[PDB]
Design a protein around this ligand. Sequence first.
Ligand SMILES: Nc1ncnc2c1ncn2[C@@H]1O[C@H](COP(=O)(O)OP(=O)(O)O)[C@@H](O)[C@H]1O
Ligand SMILES: Nc1ncnc2c1ncn2[C@@H]1O[C@H](COP(=O)(O)OP(=O)(O)O)[C@@H](O)[C@H]1O
Lengths: 291, 630, 313, 313
Amino acid sequence: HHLQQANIQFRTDIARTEYLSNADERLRWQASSLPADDLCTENAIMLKRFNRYPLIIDPSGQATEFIMNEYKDRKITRTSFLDDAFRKNLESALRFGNPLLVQDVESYDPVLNPVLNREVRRTGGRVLITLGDQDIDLSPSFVIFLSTRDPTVEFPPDLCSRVTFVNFTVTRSSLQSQCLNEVLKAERPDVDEKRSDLLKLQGEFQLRLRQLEKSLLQALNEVKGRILDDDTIITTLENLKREAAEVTRKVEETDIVMQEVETVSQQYLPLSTACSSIYFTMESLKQIHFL
Amino acid sequence: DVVVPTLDTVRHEALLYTWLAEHKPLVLCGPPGSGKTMTLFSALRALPDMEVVGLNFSSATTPELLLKTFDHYCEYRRTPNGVVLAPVQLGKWLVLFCDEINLPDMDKYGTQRVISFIRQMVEHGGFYRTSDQTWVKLERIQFVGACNPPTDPGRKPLSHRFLRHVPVVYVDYPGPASLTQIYGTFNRAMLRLIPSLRTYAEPLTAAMVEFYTMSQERFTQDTQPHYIYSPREMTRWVRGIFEALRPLETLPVEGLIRIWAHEALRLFQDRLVEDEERRWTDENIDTVALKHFPNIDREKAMSRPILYSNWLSKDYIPVDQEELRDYVKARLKVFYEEELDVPLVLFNEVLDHVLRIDRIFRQPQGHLLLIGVSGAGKTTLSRFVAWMNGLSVYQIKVHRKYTGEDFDEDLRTVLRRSGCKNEKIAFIMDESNVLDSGFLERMNTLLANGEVPGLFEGDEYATLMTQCKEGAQKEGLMLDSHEELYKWFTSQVIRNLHVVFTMNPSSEGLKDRAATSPALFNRCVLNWFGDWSTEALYQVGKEFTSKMDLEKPNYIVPDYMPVVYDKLPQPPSHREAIVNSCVFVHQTLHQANARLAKRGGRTMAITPRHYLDFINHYANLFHEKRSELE
Amino acid sequence: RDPKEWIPRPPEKYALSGHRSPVTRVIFHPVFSVMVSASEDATIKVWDYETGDFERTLKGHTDSVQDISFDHSGKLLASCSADMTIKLWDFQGFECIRTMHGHDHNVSSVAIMPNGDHIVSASRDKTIKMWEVQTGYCVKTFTGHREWVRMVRPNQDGTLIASCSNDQTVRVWVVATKECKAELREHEHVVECISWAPESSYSSISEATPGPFLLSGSRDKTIKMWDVSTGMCLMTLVGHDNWVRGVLFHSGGKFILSCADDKTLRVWDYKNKRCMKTLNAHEHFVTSLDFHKTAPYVVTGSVDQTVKVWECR
Amino acid sequence: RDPKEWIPRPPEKYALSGHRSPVTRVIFHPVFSVMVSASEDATIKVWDYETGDFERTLKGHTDSVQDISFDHSGKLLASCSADMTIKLWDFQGFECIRTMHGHDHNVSSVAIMPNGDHIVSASRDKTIKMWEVQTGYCVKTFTGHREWVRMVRPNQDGTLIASCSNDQTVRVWVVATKECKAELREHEHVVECISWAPESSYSSISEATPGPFLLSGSRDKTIKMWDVSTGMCLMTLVGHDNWVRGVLFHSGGKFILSCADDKTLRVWDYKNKRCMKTLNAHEHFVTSLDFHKTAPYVVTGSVDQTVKVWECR
Ligand SMILES: Nc1ncnc2c1ncn2[C@@H]1O[C@H](COP(=O)(O)OP(=O)(O)O)[C@@H](O)[C@H]1O
Ligand SMILES: Nc1ncnc2c1ncn2[C@@H]1O[C@H](COP(=O)(O)OP(=O)(O)O)[C@@H](O)[C@H]1O
């Protein structure tokens, strides 16, 4: 509203999640155990595009598994603040250039203050940071993540300045989708498994269509000659014909997906509405008697 | 030590000589900074038999502090009639000046341990050594005290059984008709290097009167807990003016009024919180210097920045903002290669703050007390100023399980590096570095006295004397014994150690700090940095977002025009409109934090580090999406 | 005129430009009419000061070249940079002969004593290293400073060296005995530049107050004279408005040529306790200067990437 | 030797390669020892010509660039391309500053007059546009050309703007008065390149056949020379066997180095009115050439994806 009142034009018909995240990165995030709701996608964007090292509040535990499945090739060492071998693990993470996930930041140690504040000495081309009493060669491929399990934690402003907060709260849409999925697992299992398989099929055919567009664009960007005189462009035409056949095939899968989701919607949508209402009563009931 | 005698000064001098000639206790009550330790130190200088031991009480005061004082300055001796406590200076009379008698905490059952302890050694003349439960009798020990009135917020009244053995004399502020000649003789001293300005000297002192009365009229202690005004500020005024025109040797009336206004703005505007009282003090400065100094060039004598630096030239000269800003850019370019490679942005308040920090850092016993939110660049500016003045910077490196012994060892290393090797040390520690009450008690003692009782004991005591005699023989002084060697070490610690304490503002935290620690509000100069205002946010936004491409030559200025940064130039460009929009984003989340808190949800601290995170994410997103589209 | 009465005068004879970074050190070749400068863009630019043009480029370093140095012959050069390297170049063929390693931090300054068989170096690791020019091995190691050593410089015969450091002390060591002969601690700020006294100045400082004598410029905006055999501050000259970056004796033994961060070049007479001449040198901080030992030429290298050459009159 | 007589010699000092397209224009930096090349792959490449090292690539234009122009400070770089955009580059920051729109066709040229305030732009739409640099607005417009305005250059004083077009005309205008001072119609073909005469050539032209003077090279295998004040062709060089693509004066004002489409880099003197040396530079069409004012180097940008640097001797 301030941008509209100040005559600064913005992309109105663009989702805030879709402008930042690519489709293949969204597919990789869906592969890394993340829920498909927009809030967890936004939080995945925050973890992707951090500038200050993030503090992740998570009352359910899904963000820890998402971070583990995200940086799985890069060996994340999982440690905690009250662990006895925490400073040695941090020193090994700084030396090795390893990603590091640290849990239980409610028991925060001030010794991580110069690493979080990025106070870094430049020994020429070498990079050295004084952690504690020891000067460690900081490899640039180091990240840290400060986990929290309890949602109702207050924080000092000295720690609050240096971190970017990421809250994995429970939305009505994600809860309704999870309850619909478990109701479909309990009641109509064949429809549930073929719906999951068809969703995977729709995702990989959309990936194949994007691969078509990228490959054809980069092929025609460097033909460096006549397309008609080159017979390789006829093979590009055959590739176009095959992927047009697959994008025509995708409509039948879309129709079967539509029939399945309308059947399960008219079957079990008020049930999921009751799920959302009862769990929001669960979350709001702490306002009565504190216990 | 320069005390010019007034009526109340000599009356209380005769009173204190009467109370102190009989080795009788006395309590100098009154408002803080009214000269109660001036009058006491004038009474002690009349009789050379009496030697002073300074002690400063806190809210968390224990008689173990007096036990450490007796361990240092006195000895236990065996006599046939008991065990006696006597000063190591035989024939002299030791007097213990406790600074904050009303301050130790009154318990749930209506008592104070230190007050009852002092009453026990005054009514009965001795105490109980708890090492073997033996009655020690004081041989040559008397007590004097100073306190604020008990009607002050941070002070508590004393027991009747304690004041049954002590008289109280109540000093007051000298008032305007005494301060006019008190600082008239000071200005008649100080305007002797310049023989032409003395015809303006006597109204100028008179000028320094009236502002102070409005400083006592509006800025009450109910407004802010650090709103106390004492003749120490006028002493700071005259020594700042004296150190201003000390090396200059040429100045007209306009420069004198400029120096007076600059000292007044550095002494009466830094302690203020909001900009309303800052505007009121600047308006008071304008009307007072117009009233007492007519027919003078108001444009030449008074301008906007009024900054005084000695970085560009060796003399304390008035300088413009732009040359100072360019020198600060070049010095940051030098400084990034030496201590810390953390980039710094500037605005006008950044230059003003680093001039305040350098101005307090230049003097010996320069202690800073910074008030500001976390992430506002409080310690980075102090690091830059301390590097530029050639001061080594020390942080305590706080980790988990930081007891008092590690802090005592850190303070031992700081004092040995400062007072023995004569190395200038800027001692930096945060409000989160305070974990125990002993931390604040030892910091209060170090800030007030410049020495800690019982910090060095056993073999480290003799190690301190060997290091101090080696440092004195390196310096050139032929020293001996332990008492005068400790005096020389204390003088070196006073000269070389600069302590900066930084917190965040709070409605209850600062109110409790004003009671639990006097020396942070009595011996430290307060600088209220505060949160970044809209002008600072617009300057950092417009100064980082000038490199990228933002300009629309066809831009329609909207008629609605939501303005949150004042003095937005019309017709604004696209960059000005979107920098004002960024300022609006920060302001509306400032409003949203209170909107979330008033519903019942827990709020989280908004910092300028978040704004520097938001503006840095602008250029990273703009350069990515522009290179994506191309 | 005579070599006694050379004084620089405005304006400059030449204003050479071309560096991508602030110029850090400029000196003269002793035999041929060659001038050489270095900067923070990892390059060494060789010019001809008599004709005022570009001659050669030497690109071997990776980081900011802090200081370069000559020998008694002028055929050999040593340079140091921030990559913990020391590069030993020649002059007759313009190639990098050796690359010594071993320093922990930024090698700030190098110098060669006039015997030419050895090379001294100062660095940020609070050590001074002493390398063999025939083997490229640090043979000796002076240690005892408390902070970063700014630059080191040896005396005329190679028996004494002096180092100004970030501990606000100036330490004069003996080469053979490896012990700090004089520890001069009267400066308050960091001492950034030092200089030795020539033979013809040996009487003249005694006129102002044998030896050995030593100049020292610090960040406290003062230039101090020291006697090693006494150990006291012989005189102090004030008048520089900012941090002094380069201090050098005149070849006549009577003037003091100095530069600071006030964009000025100052010529002092220490007999009259004053700066006789002040010249506007650059727009930014004048990092280094040099006086030519026989011809009337003064070179000034500065932050703003221009090297100014002044003809002395 | 002096910079006066400098003629390049085979072979090339360096053969820079890495462009994915023909090279359209190459220019030297005025003060630094680096050169910038423009090519049809919309990549503005920066190469160090002293060591032959590739430095950087600026990619802001979304179509093929034609002409690049520095300023005499070396801080701002003006670049034109066929995307209806002009781009201003901070050379010290290596990022774009502003993008200019308003041309409806291929912006075939861009230049900065020596007053350091505006930008010339010749384009395919038969007009020339004036651009304000700091604000970013199109101010003035030369109109009167009837064909493709090939390339434009302002005079050394900043009061004359000369442009060649495809209608066999060389049109010299005054900057603000908007009149065609000289509509020279003597060339038989499209004039593709002009070169403003330096001051030292002003005598040398005047005794070959005062001022101001102007060069031009066309597709009729001829390079004509014109007096601006009179308005006629004084002299003509013939001897190229194809289209002359770039014509360039010597910095000393005697020789003219010119590249033509017959794989020839020929040097011409107006005293003899012939070609003394012809160099076979590349293996394809040679588009542009450039010669340094103080350095003995000629850079040559050609279609064959290589940029060749040749030492002048
Ligand atoms: N007549 C006077 N002569 C000299 N100084 C005075 C006079 N009256 C007040 N002062 C100044 O007032 C200040 C009061 O400070 P101080 O006595 O230290 O406060 P406190 O007694 O609360 O510790 C002194 O620093 C002193 O310089
Ligand atoms: N004016 C500023 N310009 C650039 N960075 C700043 C500025 N102020 C604060 N910062 C950032 O804040 C961080 C340190 O904050 P700090 O000074 O510790 O805040 P505080 O002292 O209030 O705890 C640094 O990493 C620095 O990048």
